[PDB]
Amino acid sequence: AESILEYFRPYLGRIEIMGASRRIERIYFEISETNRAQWEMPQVKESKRQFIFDVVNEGGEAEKMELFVSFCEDTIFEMQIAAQISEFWGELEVQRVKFLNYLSRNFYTLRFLALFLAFAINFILLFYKVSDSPPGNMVYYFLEESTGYMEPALWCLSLLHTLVAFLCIIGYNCLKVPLVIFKREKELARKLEFDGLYITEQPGDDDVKGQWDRLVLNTPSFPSNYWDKFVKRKVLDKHGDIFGRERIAELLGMDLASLEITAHNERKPDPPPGLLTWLMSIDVKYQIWKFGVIFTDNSFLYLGWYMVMSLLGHYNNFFFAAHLLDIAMGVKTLRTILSSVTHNGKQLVMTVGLLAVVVYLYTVVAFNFFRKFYNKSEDEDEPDMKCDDMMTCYLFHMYVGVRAGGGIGDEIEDPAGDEYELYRVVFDITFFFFVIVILLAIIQGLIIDAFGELRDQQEQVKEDMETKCFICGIGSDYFDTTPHGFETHTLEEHNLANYMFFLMYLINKDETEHTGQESYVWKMYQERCWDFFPAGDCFRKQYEDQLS
C-alpha cells in the first residue's frame, strides 16, 4: 500500500495532545488542498514571521498559547476574506461587486503605479522657471522647449494620480478595514465574557476605548464579524445569579428577554417586502461606532491625508513634492534604515534640550561678562551689537555657534587684548569641548547602539528558533540521539501548521460529529483552557521503555 500512503500524505495531518488521561494521544485528520495552497502565500509567511519575532522577542514564557490562538484566528479570518474576494438593479449590483473585488485583489500594484505617477509628475515639474515679464508681478512658466506637450501631460498625470489615490483608498476601505473590526469585536466579546469589564467592574477613566465601546453594546447588531453569535446569552447565564438578570439584560440590549424564550409560540413573523427597507434597516449608532474605529486607525488617516494632498495638488502649487517622502517610507530597506533613527528619538530630543540649556547658560555668561566682543560690523560707528539683549544673543548663539563647528571664538573678536584674555580663552575652549565634541558623539553612539541592538535581537531570535522546540520544553540535544530526530520532531510531531489545520478542521466540522477526542478539545477551547498542549512532554518520552 505504498501508493496509497504517498497519494494521501499531503492530505494527512497528525498532532500530539494530552487529554482525558495522563498519556499523550495522537489524532489523525484531513488537510484541504485550498487551505494548504493559502498557507504557502508569501503574505501569510511574512505575517507568521512577524508573529514569531514578536513572540520570541517581547513575549514571555506565559500566555504564549493565547497569542498563538489569537494569531490562528486572525489567519482564519484572513483566509475567509481572501476566499470572499477570490473570483437593471441586479446587474448594477453585480457590476459593483465585481469592481470592488477587482479593486481589492490588486492593491499594491496600484500603490506602485501611484509611485510611478508621482515620479513622473516630479520629473515633469523639474522644468519650471520664474520670470518678471509674462512669457511671449512675477509670473511662473516652464521653459520646456517642447511646446504643448508637458503642460497638457502633467494634467493627465494629475487626474490619474487623483483617480489612483481614490481607488487605493477604496481598496483599503473594503480590504483591511474588516480585520480590525473583527479583532475589536473579538477582544470586546472576550473581555465581556471572561473579564467582566462592564459587568463586574467599570473602566471609568484613562481609557478612550472603554468609553467608546459602550455605544456598540446596546446595538442589536453587535455580532457582525465574530463567529459566536451567542456571547450575550453566555454572559447573561454566567452573571445572572450574582448580578440582577434584568440589569445585565438591559445593559446588553436584548429587548423582550421573556419573549426570547420559545415557550410562547404565539405567532410566526411575516417577511417584509424589500423596497425602501434598506434605509430603515441600517443601525445609526453601530455605523457611528464603526466610523470612529476606522477614524482611529493610523493607516486610514495616512491615506486620507494622501488624498487631501492629492486634491490640493490640483490647485497650482508644489503640493506634489511631499508625496515622494510619503511613499519612500514604504521601501523595506529604507524602513530598516529609518528604524534605527526612530529607535532612540526620545534620547535625541532630550539631547537637543540639554544642548539648548547649555547654549542658554553660555549665552547668559557671555551677556554678563563678554558683551563687548559681540560686535559684528566693519564700518565705523557701528550700532550692530548682537548681545545687547538676551533674546537676540540667544538667537545669535543658536544660529551661529551650533553650526560653526569650532566654537564662538572664530566669529567673536580677537582675544589679543590683555583684559579678560584667559577667561575668554577658557570660555572658547569649554564651548568647543562641551558642544561640538561630546554632544555629537552621543548622537552617533545612540544610532550605532540601536543598530547593534537590532543585530543582537535578530541573532537571539534566530538562535532561539534553532535551539528550541517552541512547543515542548525538551532541547534538541535529546532529539539528536537518533539520526535527524529533531527534524522529524519539528516537521511531523509538531509543525504548527498541523495545529492550524486541526483548528480549521474543528471549526469546519459541526458540533454533531465531533469525535470524542475532538469534542474534548472543542470543550477545552470553549472554556479557554490550554491544558491539552503537551508543554514539556512528547510521545517518545512517555513511551521511552519501548523503542517506538
Ligand X SMILES: CCCCCCCC/C=C\CCCCCCCC(=O)O[C@H](COC(=O)CCCCCCCCCCCCCCC)COP(=O)([O-])OCC[N+](C)(C)C
Ligand Y SMILES: Nc1ncnc2c1ncn2[C@@H]1O[C@H](COP(=O)(O)OP(=O)(O)CP(=O)(O)O)[C@@H](O)[C@H]1O
User: What residues numbered 322-351 form the site for ligand X, per CB under 6 A?
Assistant: 322, 325
Q: How far is the CB of 365 from ligand X (least distance, A)?
A: 4
In the three-class reduction of DSSP (H, G, I as helix; E, B as strand; rest coil), residue 12 is classed as strand
Q: Is 469 in the site for Zn ion (CB under 5 A)?
A: yes
Gyration radius of the chain's alpha carbons: 34
| CA distances (Å), origin 108, targets 38, 112, 203, 326, 541 | 19, 6, 40, 15, 49
Binding track, positions 333-372, relative to a copy of itself; x by CB under 8 A: xx--x--xx----xx--xx--x--x--xx--x---x--x-
Q: What is the DSSP letter of 371?
A: G
Q: Is 216 in the site for Zn ion (CB under 5 A)?
A: no
Q: Which residue from 146, 166, 140 is spatially nearest to 316, judged by alpha carbons?
A: 140
Instruction: State how far the Cα of 386 lies from the Cα of 362, in Å rounded to an integer.
Output: 15
In the three-class reduction of DSSP (H, G, I as helix; E, B as strand; rest coil), residue 500 is classed as helix
Binding track, positions 289-318, relative to a copy of itself; x by CB under 8 A: -----------------------------x
Q: How far is the CB of 538 from ligand Y (least distance, A)?
A: 11
Binding track, positions 137-156, relative to ligand Y; x by CB under 6 A: --------------------
Residue number with CB closer to ligand X (362 or 396): 362
155 neighbors 316 (Cβ within 8 angstroms): no
Q: How far is the CB of 166 from ligand X (least distance, A)?
A: 20
Stretch that binds ligand X, among 42-50, 119-127, 424-432, 504-512 (CB under 6 A): 424-432
312 neighbors 242 (Cβ within 8 angstroms): no
Q: Taking CB under 8 A as the criterion, which residues in 378-407 touch a copy of itself?
A: 388-391, 394-395, 398-399, 402-407
- Which partner in Zn ion, a copy of itself, ligand X, none is near 85 (CB below 5 to 8 A by kind)? none
Q: Taking CB under 8 A as the criterion, which residues in 214-233 touch a copy of itself?
A: none
99 neighbors 149 (Cβ within 8 angstroms): no
| CA terminus-to-terminus distance, the chain | 22
Residues 6 or more apart in contact with residue 249 via CB below 8 angstroms: 236, 257
Q: Is 321 in the site for a copy of itself (CB under 8 A)?
A: yes
Stretch that binds ligand Y, among 193-201, 352-360, 494-502, 505-513 (CB under 6 A): 494-502
Whose cell is 451567542? That residue is: 230
12 neighbors 525 (Cβ within 8 angstroms): no
Q: What is the DSSP letter of 13?
A: E
Please provide residue 11's backbone torsions phi and psi, each rounded to the nearest 5 degrees. -90, -5
- Which partner in ligand X, a copy of itself, ligand Y, none is near 388 (CB below 5 to 8 A by kind)? a copy of itself
219 neighbors 253 (Cβ within 8 angstroms): yes
Q: Is 364 in the site for ligand X (CB under 6 A)?
A: yes
Q: Which of 128, 149, 302, 369 binds ligand X (CB under 6 A)?
A: 369
Q: Is 496 in the site for ligand Y (CB under 6 A)?
A: yes
- Which partner in Zn ion, ligand X, a copy of itself, none is near 354 (CB below 5 to 8 A by kind)? a copy of itself
Q: Which of 254, 365, 436, 497 binds ligand X (CB under 6 A)?
A: 365
Stretch that binds ligand X, among 313-321, 387-395, 450-458, 486-494 (CB under 6 A): 313-321
Q: Taking CB under 6 A as the criterion, which residues in 29-58 touch ligand Y?
A: 45
Q: Is 15 in the site for Zn ion (CB under 5 A)?
A: no
Instruction: State how far the Cα of 225 lies from the Cα of 524, in Å rounded to an integer.
Output: 23
- Which partner in ligand Y, a copy of itself, ligand X, none is near 362 (CB below 5 to 8 A by kind)? ligand X
Q: Which residue from 303, 74, 276 is spatially nearest to 172, judged by alpha carbons?
A: 303
Instruction: State how far the Cα of 439 lies from the Cα of 434, in Å rounded to an integer.
Output: 7
In this structure, how many other beta carbons lie within 10 angstroms of the beta carbon of residue 231?
19
Residue number with CB closer to a copy of itself (157 or 474): 474
358 neighbors 435 (Cβ within 8 angstroms): yes
Please provide residue 30's backbone torsions phi and psi, each rounded to the nearest 5 degrees. -105, 140
Q: Which residues of 149-176 are buried (b: 16+ CB within 10 A; e: fewer)?
A: ebeeebeebbebbbebbebbbbbbbbbb
Amino acid at 377: S
Q: How far is the CB of 441 from a copy of itself (least distance, A)?
A: 4
- Which partner in ligand Y, Zn ion, a copy of itself, none is near 215 (CB below 5 to 8 A by kind)? none
Q: Taking CB under 8 A as the criterion, which residues in 477-506 touch a copy of itself?
A: 477, 480-485
- Interface residue list for ligand Y (CB under 6 A): 45, 465-466, 469-471, 490, 494-496
Q: Which residues bind Zn ion (CB under 5 A)?
A: 469, 471-472, 494
